[PDB]
Design a protein around this ligand. Structure first.
Ligand SMILES: O=C(CCCCCCC(=O)Nc1ccc(I)cc1)NO
Ligand SMILES: [K+]
Ligand SMILES: [K+]
Ligand SMILES: [Zn+2]
Length: 355
């Protein structure tokens, strides 16, 4: 039918209590919604209710120990929240975090429901907190629960999906998603990210392309690390055309989930990349060719309010069926070196890569 959109004001109901300038702030999602409206895109979407994730849903990924400690966050004093946050890497807490995080997960599951039952063609959750760093028993990197990792397993259980592709074009490596599915050949994880031999957060050798998955998961984890700043649309277009999409068509997923971060867009104060927002119209378009176009995007990172709004808008135009834009740009030496090396590491597992 149409394109679903989930957003709730509860997504604005948590923020960093000890820094008023923390980049992961409520104005991220309200600026996206403002631009979607002024551009006429919001009204062309099917509005979809959010819902709170269930514990059984959360237990698809997270431990009962971690869920309960999380649920306890809504009744801790500030000091007890600040003290638990410091036990994690790059994470703040707030009395409303757990509630908004449950709705952040559920927003994705609502879209998976409507897309998997052909009620909608695709959808986009304008959610925070983000998720792709959250791990089975740990907060990490502004994330409490791993939205897409839960959605992937949820789709497999509730909708009898065999194979899920997760595409993570946020500028950071989604190491949480990697770890959850590291041994799992039914969930193919692809991440393109700033890396710089480990100097860029999260500073993990596991973010390099030599991490291809383990055991039965070998070949089903694909990292494309950038080792020079300033990458552009041509770097991402090349990556998608000759690496991800060949592997995707060969994998034949039944659902595609996008960790839709926009911190690689030019102007982001964190990602140090130069991607134009319209590039994501082209990347989104390519993904619509797989899995009968059953495609759900969920907001991850992106910290320039205007650049992230424009990146969401370009993605949305493609979800809605608008013509592909003209791009004023046209890969660098560092980017091609990265793509060759990732292809080399994944060569033995994918015929579509073999030339
Ligand atoms: O986008 C993301 C999550 C990004 C996590 C990055 C952690 C390091 C960092 O930049 N921390 C920071 C702390 C305070 C201020 I003020 C500005 C920045 N995942 O995709
Ligand atoms: K990524
Ligand atoms: K995997
Ligand atoms: Zn990010």
């Amino acid at each position: 039918t149409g394109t679903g959109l989930v957003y709730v004001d509860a997504f604005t109901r948590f923020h960093c209590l000890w820094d008023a300038s923390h980049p992961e702030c409520p104005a991220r999602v309200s600026t996206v919604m403002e631009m979607l409206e002024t551009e006429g895109l919001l009204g062309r979407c099917v509005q979809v209710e959010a819902r709170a994730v269930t514990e059984d849903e959360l237990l698809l990924v997270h431990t009962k120990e971690y869920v309960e400690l999380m649920k306890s966050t809504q009744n801790m004093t500030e000091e007890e929240l600040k003290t638990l946050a410091e036990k994690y890497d790059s994470v703040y807490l707030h009395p409303g975090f757990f509630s908004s995080a449950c709705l952040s997960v559920g927003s994705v599951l609502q879209l998976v429901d409507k897309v998997m039952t052909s009620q909608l063609r695709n959808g986009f959750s304008i959610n925070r907190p983000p998720g792709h760093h959250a791990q089975a028993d740990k907060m990490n990197g502004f994330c409490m629960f791993n939205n897409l990792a839960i959605a992937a397993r949820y789709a497999q259980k509730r909708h009898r999906v065999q194979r899920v592709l997760i595409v993570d074009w946020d500028v950071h490596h989604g190491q949480g998603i990697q770890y959850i599915f590291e041994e799992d050949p039914s969930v193919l994880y692809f991440s393109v990210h700033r890396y710089e031999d480990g100097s860029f957060w999260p500073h993990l050798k596991e973010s390099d392309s030599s991490s291809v998955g383990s055991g039965a998961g070998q070949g089903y984890n694909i990292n494309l690390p950038w080792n020079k700043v300033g990458m552009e649309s041509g770097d991402y277009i090349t990556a998608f055309q000759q690496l991800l999409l060949p592997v995707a068509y060969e994998f034949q997923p039944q659902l595609v989930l996008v960790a839709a971060g926009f911190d690689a867009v030019i102007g982001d104060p964190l990602g140090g990349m130069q991607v134009s927002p319209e590039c994501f119209s082209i990347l989104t378009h390519m993904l619509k060719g797989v899995a009968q176009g059953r495609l759900v995007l969920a907001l991850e990172g992106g910290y320039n309010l205007q650049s992230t709004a424009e990146g969401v808008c370009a993605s949305m135009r493609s979800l809605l069926g608008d013509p592909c834009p003209h791009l004023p740009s046209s890969p660098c030496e560092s980017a091609l070196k990265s793509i060759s090396k990732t292809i080399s590491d994944l060569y033995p597992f994918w015929k579509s890569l073999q030339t």
